[PDB]
Amino acid sequence: AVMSQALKATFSGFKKEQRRLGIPKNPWLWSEQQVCQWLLWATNEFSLVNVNLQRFGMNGQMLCNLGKERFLELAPDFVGDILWEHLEQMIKEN
Ligand SMILES: [Ca+2]
C-alpha cells in the first residue's frame, strides 16, 4: 500500500539494468536467462538470500502466463509481493 508505492520508485532502476544486459523492455520476449537476470537484479537491489531460482527456470512467456496466485507461491514471502508489482507494471507498460 504505502510501502508498495514507495518501493515502486526503485523499479525505475531496472531500466538501466535492461539496457546493460540487453534485456528487452517487454517481458514476453525474455529468455530463461533474462528471467534469471531480473531475479538477480532484485536479489542484489533488495538484499535477498533465496529467490527460488530453481522455480523460475522458464521463458518470459511462461513468467507472463503465471498469474498473481502462482507467482506468489513460487516467490519468497513479502518479496513475491514486491516482484509481482514490478512484473505486472512491466507487462502493463512495456
Ligand atoms: Ca505489454
From Swiss-Prot:
Domain PNT: 9-94
UniProt superkingdom: Eukaryota
Localization of this protein: Nucleus
Family statement: Belongs to the ETS family.
Free-text function comment from the UniProt entry: Transcription factor activating transcription. Binds specifically the DNA GGAA/T core motif (Ets-binding site or EBS) in gene promoters and stimulates transcription.
Protein name as it appears in the record: Protein C-ets-2
Species for this entry: Homo sapiens
Residues of the full protein shown: 77 to 170 of 469
